[PDB]
Symmetry: D2
């Protein structure tokens, strides 16, 4: 049978077929998980994408900034999975940061309203999503978010890095809350994955300064990674998340698991 048999897992974050949450959903379903998906803006668009999944699953609207979406989320899920049923897994795979705070723009030229908006979506929403769903979660359940190692600074990532340093702090705190329900909360720190913005800067959407930079950071990842790293394959990352959602890591919470090919453990 499948890694996640008879587990009901909410997976947010799907926008395209290159999304990390798309492959987290695909694998979860491949491992026999009943899913519940959420989407942010282009619900019609994500309907077309989510239809390309192994199995049919309810799709709810969730704008983590929206105070109404959050207040109503549990009940909507209750309706979708069926009264008397609970969640065994929540996948937070949400991120955002205006151009001002990430990319070619000077680190010091990001206005706070932009940084604030990105932290809200990339860091605080993890707590508010756990606050909504914790109540309708089963003991032994698992909440996992996506992270990008922010231990050290780097070019381009700038204020996103500061948002991810927030998310890791938030995660350890959400573990406190989540423990009172016997639920774990961890983050999967993945190496770079080609999606849209990052698989666009290739040719040079950001210019010759950028491109040739990210193309360097990415490149070095595959060298540093003792088992290597293919930025065009989001499957290994997705499987790590499934391992976190499963029951084979029942004593690990408030933590961070690194799906980056070991790159973060090697200097050169």
């Amino acid at each position: 049978t499948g890694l996640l048999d008879g587990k009901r897992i909410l997976v947010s974050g799907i926008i395209t077929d290159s999304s990390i949450a798309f492959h987290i959903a695909r694998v979860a379903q491949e491992q026999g998980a009943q899913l519940v998906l959420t989407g942010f803006d282009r619900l019609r668009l994500i309907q077309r994408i989510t239809d390309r999944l192994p199995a049919k699953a309810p799709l709810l609207e969730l704008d983590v900034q929206n105070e109404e979406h959050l207040a109503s989320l549990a009940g909507r899920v209750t309706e979708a999975i069926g009264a008397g049923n609970k969640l065994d897994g929540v996948v937070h795979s949400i991120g955002f940061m205006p151009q001002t705070g990430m990319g070619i723009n000077p680190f010091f030229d990001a206005p706070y309203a932009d940084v604030s908006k990105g932290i809200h979506i990339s860091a605080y929403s993890y707590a508010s999503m756990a606050k909504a769903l914790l109540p309708i979660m089963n003991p032994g359940g698992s909440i996992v978010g996506m992270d990008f190692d922010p231990s050290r600074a780097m070019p381009a990532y700038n204020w996103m890095t500061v948002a991810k340093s927030a998310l890791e702090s938030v995660n350890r705190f959400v573990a406190r809350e989540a423990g009172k329900y016997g639920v774990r909360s961890n983050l999967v720190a993945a190496g770079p994955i080609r999606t849209l913005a990052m698989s666009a800067i290739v040719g040079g959407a950001l210019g010759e300064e950028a491109g040739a930079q990210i193309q360097l950071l990415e490149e070095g990842w595959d060298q540093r990674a003792p088992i290597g790293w293919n930025m065009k394959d989001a499957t290994p990352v997705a499987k790590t998340v499934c391992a976190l959602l499963s029951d084979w890591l029942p004593a690990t919470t408030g933590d961070i698991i690194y799906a980056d090919g070991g790159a973060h453990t090697q200097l050169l």
Copy 2:
């Protein structure tokens, strides 16, 4: 002679005489530094307090949330220290967080507008302050801010801990920008210092504070901010010229010990 002779150092954060920034200023002055102090809201009040310092130094108004204070900050400092003169050191010792996101309030009940306000004052202001002053800073200068180890979660500190996780990340980036000026940028992670909440808090804080002194191999006195103020001066000095984007712990070593 003093550790910081001839150094023009801007020091923010004083509000009372218990303020970590008060002792930083007091020690920097004792070590022969020319200070420029900034205050946030109660300028008259902090005038009373800053008058209790070893030496007289210009007091400017700075509210890190105010876009006008920031844009003008450099020019006003230039006028206080004199045209042609530049700063050798900047002390960010600013911290805030509404009760909603820190204390007895449940962690999940902090509304973002609050959390966001606290991160703006506690984390982002470090970058915006650096962005303002970096241009009027001398090579080999030092920017140092205050921190409280947010590596692990804990009761009460809650969202402040999240704001500090942000500062440390901001600091590594400010080190990048500051490098372009030959300027370092580090954080000093101090143990708790004394500067109502009920029986849970008076139990927790006095239990967390207590265990600090136990864990600390040299011990920890929460009623003395001097050890911390000296660590900030060592950072402002020239005896740590190769360290930037880093964090120096003035905590009695508590953070290196488990029990």
Copy 3:
């Protein structure tokens, strides 16, 4: 089907039925793995114990200090699993340290020959074991060893903590060598598990152990090694194919919490 179906996994470290390696083997077998077990000194004794496992598996002699056991290890495994067959997983669950360098003895009174013996068995043997078996391992295989967070110092554990700081460093290097074979290499940092020393120890261990369960957001039961044995199996499986040279914590989250 099981997590580790069709996987040939070598598991060392069993000595009693409380041994973390016993439950690792028990769980790997419950998840349909073909095991090859190794034992150190009391082979007859561990035969009695290994007979208490779900399934029957070959038991080889391995004393990581013995240069002959190491050189022959591959060939003997080849013969047990069959020529042409290779290993998919190696479990290093070996640990030692004389009383001199761990327990009530003062930290400064541990003679090197002792400390060196403990590091040889507890740290270096991880590399020498990897060097022996890596050649008879399949791509996508997994080497996992046991660890106890040595980030911070603590009473009693003393030089074992130093030996574990070494293992973690050894592990990052074994990840390099192992990568050349498409093999991962990680450590599982478990909370204390039950497997005389006087009133100080019975006070400390029961105080350190106790506070573990408090710190742990999901709690921690030192009388149950199963959660730990499952984490080792998740590492041996294929649901963590992108993680190597790393450390997975099976400790109830205790290490992410301060108080």
Copy 4:
């Protein structure tokens, strides 16, 4: 006056004029510190070198493996500084590792007797040196050793990296011991410094594989370092040690201070 006025500091580790301990001594003396030096093998040779210091200081023999040198060390120092006088600072700047465990040799081909010998000298000796001198140290005193960030693996450094991971663990423990005497114990994690072996592999003492590698790791250090890093200047490292020996860091022990130009805090 000087940073270390009227402080009596033992400084070991001087073998040549490029030694990190040579500059730690030179600066300490420049800051008005009474020194006590120790040497390992070529005492005659180090006599010639130590004579090139700002000021005259007693030179004792200390082979950290030798059980006799350790047992007699305090008394010899007592004699050199004068009965009734104590040390205010100890500088551990000792390292060793046979070619087998560091360089071009395969990581797996280092025999334990070699690794053991290097850990003994590079890690355990820090404890045994503190065990000898702690008794003749003043409250407020400072014990500092030299370290090289071993968080992540790297080429060439191999078993030395494993020795430094040991030393950092040892350091936190020595802090326990050292606290009972009101003495601090920290490590200075420096970036690479041209000495003898490392300033030899330049041309290619280790070959074209090496050289072009270390020359890469070194190079990248100066790029990653936001204030940059000059591998030909050991002065900034020495001054950090003096800051640790001084009284301007009285609340930091069992810790590690990084003198590497910030390189360890930057990814690219």
